Amino acid sequence: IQRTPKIQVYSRHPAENGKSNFLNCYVSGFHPSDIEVDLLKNGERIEKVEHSDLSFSKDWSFYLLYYTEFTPTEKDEYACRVNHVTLSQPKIVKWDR
Amino acid sequence: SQEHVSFHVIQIFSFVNQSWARGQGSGWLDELQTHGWDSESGTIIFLHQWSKGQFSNEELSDLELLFRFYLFGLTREIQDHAQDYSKYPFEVQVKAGCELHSGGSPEGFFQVAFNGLDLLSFQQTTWVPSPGCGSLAQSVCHLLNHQYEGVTETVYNLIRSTCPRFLLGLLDAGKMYVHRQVRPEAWLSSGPSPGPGRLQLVCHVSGFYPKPVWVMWMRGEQEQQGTQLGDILPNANGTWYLRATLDVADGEAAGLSCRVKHSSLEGQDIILYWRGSLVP
Numbered sequence: 072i073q074r075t076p077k078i079q080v081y082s083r084h085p086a087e088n089g090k091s092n093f094l095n096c097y098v099s100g101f102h103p104s105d106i107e108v109d110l111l112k113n114g115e116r117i118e119k120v121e122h123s124d125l126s127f128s129k130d131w132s133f134y135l136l137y138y139t140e141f142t143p144t145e146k147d148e149y150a151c152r153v154n155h156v157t158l159s160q161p162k163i164v165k166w167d168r
Numbered sequence: 169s170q171e172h173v174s175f176h177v178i179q180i181f182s183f184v185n186q187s188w189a190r191g192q193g194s195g196w197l198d199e200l201q202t203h204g205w206d207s208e209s210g211t212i213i214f215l216h217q218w219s220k221g222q223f224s225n226e227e228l229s230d231l232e233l234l235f236r237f238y239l240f241g242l243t244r245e246i247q248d249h250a251q252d253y254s255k256y257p258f259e260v261q262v263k264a265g266c267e268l269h270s271g272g273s274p275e276g277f278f279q280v281a282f283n284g285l286d287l288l289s290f291q292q293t294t295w296v297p298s299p300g301c302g303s304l305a306q307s308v309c310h311l312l313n314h315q316y317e318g319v320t321e322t323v324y325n326l327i328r329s330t331c332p333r334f335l336l337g338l339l340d341a342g343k344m345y346v347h348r349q350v351r352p353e354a355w356l357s358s359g360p361s362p363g364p365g366r367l368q369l370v371c372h373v374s375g376f377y378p379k380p381v382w383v384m385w386m387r388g389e390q391e392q393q394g395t396q397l398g399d400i401l402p403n404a405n406g407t408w409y410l411r412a413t414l415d416v417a418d419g420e421a422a423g424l425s426c427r428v429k430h431s432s433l434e435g436q437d438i439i440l441y442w443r444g445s446l447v448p
């Protein structure tokens with residue numbers, strides 16, 4: 072069957088305005104592997120992201136880690152957006168410090 | 169240690185329609201990716217300085233040639249035995265490799281899934297279809313059991329002999345990485361409100377390696393019973409992340425602290441007291 076992605080967003084370091092950090096988005100438990108994951112700044116896609124090669128667990132569901140270097144500020148909003156065949160609309164999970 | 173250790177090669181490919189497919193492959197030492205695959209040039213990507221795992225360039229080149237021959241044969245056979253558009257798209261997953269048990273006994277495996285369900289596996293010297301995958305599984309195993317005997321023998325030797333030798337060579341070549349200690353940092357935050365007059369306390373622990381870690385919410389030496397530990401989540405660069413959370417009533421959060429123990433800390437636990445809005 073088709074399994075819907077779980078999405079977890081978290082920073083590598085404590086959020087401090089003006090200090091360089093990394094934002095992680097871990098997307099897991101989905102099937103099939105066709106997926107669109109994007110990290111967002113103020114609702115816009117971030118190009119300078121890195122992601123793990125596709126992998127899967129013992130139940131054959133897939134998982135991916137995304138991360139990007141960012142500098143948090145008071146005005147900037149960051150998020151992880153996922154689209155998948157199981158989702159009626161893209162799911163956006165905002166990061167909150 | 170007595171811990172079991174594994175090496176896996178995985179393959180994921182999907183046919184969007186009868187004549188178009190895409191695929192990816194990689195190699196993993198436990199949960200650490202050690203190898204990629206460049207599908208254009210059809211060659212192994214070595215992700216670490218120690219990723220050749222004490223194998224010679226000739227051994228690795230022969231393995232590369234083997235994988236390319238496998239991909240060529242797989243493509244030709246799927247094209248010949250494909251063509252109803254209702255069967256597409258479909259996705260295949262392959263997981264092959266070995267597990268080394270505590271005494272040194274190797275165990276090889278080769279497992280395949282189709283559309284997220286078990287399809288078949290390699291048992292001793294036989295391709296065994298999964299019952300749940302019905303006639304397709306039987307068909308594929310028939311082809312593998314009766315038309316590619318050399319393939320069966322090659323797979324047997326790869327997962328029972330080549331794989332454990334490579335796995336241990338990787339552990340040796342990478343000994344300064346696999347035995348490293350990386351100290352975490354920790355910090356507190358508020359989580360989603362449990363309800364009116366309640367607080368969610370969050371202790372973040374980030375950047376630790378290896379994975380065993382101890383984190384708890386405490387009042388003095390007493391562990392708090394409501395503490396929930398999240399999934400241990402990956403950071404880039406091989407380290408891990410964990411959130412420990414506790415719901416408490418407003419007016420009862422003062423005096424609570426997060427305590428972190430990890431092998432890298434050499435006896436000096438991290439202790440953070442919840443401040444919240446208590447300090448003006």
Ligand SMILES: CCCCCCCCCCCCCCCC(=O)OC[C@H](O)CO
Nearest residue numbers: 191192193194195203205235264331334
């Ligand atoms: C099976 C046990 C073998 C033990 C020794 C292994 C030596 C290093 C192999 C790691 C390479 C990982 C990449 C292989 C991925 C691969 O071949 O798949 C291509 C995709 O299908 C592209 O379409």
Ligand SMILES: CCCCCCCCCCCCCCCC
Nearest residue numbers: 249250255258260280308319323
């Ligand atoms: C009838 C349309 C679907 C066809 C599905 C073909 C799946 C093939 C799985 C076999 C993968 C390789 C097995 C190991 C070869 C050494």
Ligand SMILES: *[C@@H]1O[C@H](CO)[C@@H](O)[C@H](O)[C@H]1NC(C)=O
Nearest residue numbers: 183184185186187188189190
């Ligand atoms: C098959 O799928 C590929 C990839 O999406 C597409 O480019 C191609 O046109 C398709 N072929 C068909 C529908 O015959």
Ligand SMILES: O=S(=O)([O-])CC[NH2+]C1CCCCC1
Nearest residue numbers: 181189190191207239242243
């Ligand atoms: O770069 S790529 O076009 O995605 C490589 C695809 N080769 C695989 C297609 C599915 C059958 C096994 C070989």
Ligand SMILES: O=S(=O)([O-])CC[NH2+]C1CCCCC1
Nearest residue numbers: 126127174176178196198199
């Ligand atoms: O250490 S372990 O629990 O054996 C690793 C389990 N996941 C792996 C299975 C297939 C290769 C990708 C990662």
Ligand SMILES: O=S(=O)([O-])CC[NH2+]C1CCCCC1
Nearest residue numbers: 197198199200346378379380
């Ligand atoms: O920290 S841990 O997940 O318990 C270690 C298990 N595997 C490690 C050993 C071999 C190299 C890959 C990482």
Ligand SMILES: CCCCCCCCCCCC
Nearest residue numbers: 238241242245246249307308
């Ligand atoms: C060299 C490996 C060849 C594996 C062939 C499996 C694909 C056959 C599909 C049969 C569909 C009934």
Ligand SMILES: CCCCCCCCCC
Nearest residue numbers: 177234237238264319322
């Ligand atoms: C381990 C990934 C699949 C390798 C199969 C190679 C055997 C086919 C060539 C005879």
